Design a binder for this molecule. Structure first.
Ligand SMILES: OC[C@H]1O[C@H](O[C@H]2[C@H](O)[C@@H](O)[C@@H](O)O[C@@H]2CO)[C@H](O)[C@@H](O)[C@@H]1O
Ligand SMILES: *[C@@H]1O[C@H](CO)[C@@H](O)[C@H](O)[C@H]1NC(C)=O
Length: 668
């Protein structure tokens, strides 16, 4: 995972999309502006983004169907989109409606996705028009060693068209609003579609464990005559020798299959310093005939939101079929509750298809699990002038800690990466309790002025003399760092001695390295993503956390709530420093500290404020006096509600951080 860096763009998009073409567009944008663009497709990126954006990192731009973005915007994780009317006129209005949340545009619409029925012409010159005739057809095809239909059953998105065919829906829309207390997952028609699916699996016309890979591999090799998929899937079929047609989904109970219409959208991370660059890229490069053509060449986008290129794409009969099915379905709601809904429906379908539940029990349960938490406010990013949060953590982008029994020399490796320009770094090596000599290998990404503190350590240095400049240089204990890739640097260093710790740090402001603190028993040091270095390494990153806040409506008086939520495995004391500036002589404020059960809080504040925490807390002035905490809500909205209970009209600070040792908050 590439961290955010000012002057560059990170982009997340699902692994089934045309990220190759999108990266091509990024190479164009880089050529023009000199801004590099890194496109990646992490697994479950839609569930990862909300957690990662709150820490300040994550992609500058996230690509996903609109249904999720509402959630993100409720948590204050997306910047407001303010395109010029001239640009707004270039895309269809309804695609803008998809990205409308509380009157604000939260993303850019890209494409319009809808599932279609893909069939093999050689196997099925005349594909059935109804679900009901599929079984009778699968008998005939199984006689020939084939199957009628195979599509992904592990995601409710693919099976929804049949559930919704009769009276099935997610959230009823009326009076210009979605009613979150009205859900149509457990109704009769949904039960009928899902019961017909369960009847297909029950008769061995489909395999309950079939997934995306199984269905794609099966259809591309001619094992099955039919599959259900979206535009993105046509490319891999083109490579295959299969002669395929793309047409309207079958009817169920005489009614057309209603797929959920998605709108591939690009949201701009509220933690991004490159917002203006992301708007430039999305508006003037990605959304053009050329850009959308480059992406669509890799993986078809379906119908694009951009009108000029849509007028060309509609000439594709496959896109025409996508539109035909989309016209019969329902654009997904974009509300924050959709996530929960999806989870529920998922576990329902699965459990109902595996036989663990009856359709009735599975769907009733779905209706109950879809219930979402109470929302107390819409969070909003807070600017630097209002508040700033800096912290020290033990977590690293990549890291490893290991023990070296009997080793006469131990090796520590640091892969340090910095943005453009000279950077300043403080590095301190802390001696272990007692003669073992140490090797420090530090490779740097740019020029760095370094304060190295190593006291009573028989230390050897390995670095680049041209990039690293010392405030206090040593004369003799130095080795010129060879220019290898990182893995080869690790092996080169291992040729001198075993590696006890290694870490890749992005734009570190300060670093502390503790010798002889090796945790557990691990003899080989292997880099793992998002590793917790424990006591071995503690560093202060330069990028600050994402601070958020809001106003709690219907709450009298002026009372500020400052919330810090530490994210999740042993007893840990988090130091929390609070500096409130321009605070009135008498200020009513509360500090809410939420974290796992194993976290104690050590509080130091320049102001006298209420204290509301989990676990236990102690003031920095009274180390050994322990005050037991309360049981606090786990969710962000839960904590906001706890703030409302405390008569807080204004949430001044809201921060979410992982595995933090020290946390300094500042608010004015
Ligand atoms: O199944 C739950 C899932 O449904 C939708 O995800 C789609 C997505 O819209 C398509 O672009 C493509 O990636 O297929 C996905 C299903 O595998 C929702 O957009 C998503 O929020 C939800 O998790
Ligand atoms: C530092 O590394 C990051 C990612 O590895 C890269 O984007 C950036 O350009 C590098 N800095 C320099 C000065 O090359």
């Amino acid at each position: 995972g590439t961290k955010i860096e000012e002057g560059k763009l990170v982009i997340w998009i699902n692994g089934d999309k045309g990220y190759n073409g999108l990266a091509e567009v990024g190479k164009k944008f880089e050529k023009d502006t000199g801004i590099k663009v890194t496109v990646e497709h992490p697994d479950k990126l839609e569930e990862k983004f909300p957690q990662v954006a709150a820490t300040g990192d994550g992609p500058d731009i996230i690509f996903w169907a609109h249904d999720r973005f509402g959630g993100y915007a409720q948590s204050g994780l997306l910047a407001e989109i303010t395109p010029a009317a001239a640009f707004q006129d270039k895309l269809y209005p309804f695609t803008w409606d998809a990205v409308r949340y509380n009157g604000k545009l939260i993303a850019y619409p890209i494409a319009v996705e809808a599932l279609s029925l893909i069939y093999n012409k050689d196997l099925l010159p005349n594909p059935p028009k109804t679900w009901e005739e599929i079984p009778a057809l699968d008998k005939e095809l199984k006689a020939k060693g084939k199957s009628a239909l195979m599509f992904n059953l592990q995601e409710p998105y693919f099976t929804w068209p049949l559930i919704a065919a009769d009276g099935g829906y997610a959230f009823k829309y009326a009076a210009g609003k979605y009613d979150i207390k009205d859900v149509g997952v457990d109704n009769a028609g949904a039960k009928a579609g899902l019961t017909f699916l369960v009847d297909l699996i029950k008769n061995k016309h489909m395999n309950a464990d079939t997934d995306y890979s199984i269905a794609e591999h099966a259809f591309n090799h001619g094992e099955t005559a039919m599959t259900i998929n979206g535009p993105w899937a046509w490319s891999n079929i083109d490579t295959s020798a299969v002669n395929y047609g793309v047409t309207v989904l079958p009817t169920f109970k005489g009614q057309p299959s209603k797929p959920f219409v998605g709108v591939l959208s690009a949201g701009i991370n509220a933690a991004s310093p490159n917002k203006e660059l992301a708007k430039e890229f999305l508006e003037n490069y990605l959304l053009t005939d050329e850009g959308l053509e480059a992406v669509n060449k890799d993986k078809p986008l379906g119908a694009v939101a951009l009108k000029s290129y849509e007028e060309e794409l509609v000439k594709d009969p496959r896109v025409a079929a996508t539109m035909e099915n989309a016209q019969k379905g329902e654009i997904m709601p974009n509300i924050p509750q959709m996530s929960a809904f999806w989870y529920a429906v998922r576990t329902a379908v699965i459990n109902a298809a595996s036989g663990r539940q009856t359709v009735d029990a599975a769907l009733a349960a779905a209706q109950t699990n879809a219930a979402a938490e109470t929302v107390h406010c819409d969070l909003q990013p807070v600017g630097p002038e209002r508040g700033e949060v800096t912290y020290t953590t033990s977590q690293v982008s990549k890291g490893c800690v290991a023990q070296a029994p009997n080793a006469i020399l131990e090796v520590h490796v640091l892969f340090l990466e910095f943005p453009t320009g000279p950077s300043q770094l403080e590095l301190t090596l802390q001696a272990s309790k007692q003669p073992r000599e140490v090797l420090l290998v530090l490779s740097v990404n740019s020029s760095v002025f370094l304060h190295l503190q190593a006291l009573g350590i028989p230390l050897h240095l390995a670095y680049n003399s041209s990039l690293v400049t010392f405030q206090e240089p040593p004369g003799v204990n130095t080795t010129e760092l060879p220019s290898f890739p990182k893995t080869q640097i690790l092996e080169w260093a291992a040729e001198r001695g075993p590696i006890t710790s290694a870490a890749e740090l992005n734009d570190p402001q300060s670093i502390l390295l503790r010798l002889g603190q090796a945790q557990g028993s691990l003899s080989f040091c292997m880099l793992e993503a998002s590793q917790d270095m424990g006591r071995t390494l503690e560093w202060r990153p330069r990028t600050p956390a994402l601070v958020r806040g809001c106003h709690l409506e219907g709450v009298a008086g002026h009372k500020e709530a400052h919330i810090l939520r530490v994210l999740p495995a042993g007893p840990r004391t988090v130091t929390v420093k609070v500096e409130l500036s321009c605070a009135p002589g008498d200020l009513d404020a509360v500090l809410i500290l939420q974290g796992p059960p194993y976290v104690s809080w050590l509080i130091d504040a320049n102001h006298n404020m209420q204290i509301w925490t989990t676990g236990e807390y102690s003031f920095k002035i009274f180390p050994e006096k322990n005050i037991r905490g309360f049981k606090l809500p786990d969710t962000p909205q839960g904590l906001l509600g706890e703030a409302r209970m405390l008569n807080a009209s204004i949430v001044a600070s809201f921060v979410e951080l992982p595995l933090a040792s020290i946390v300094s908050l500042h608010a004015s």
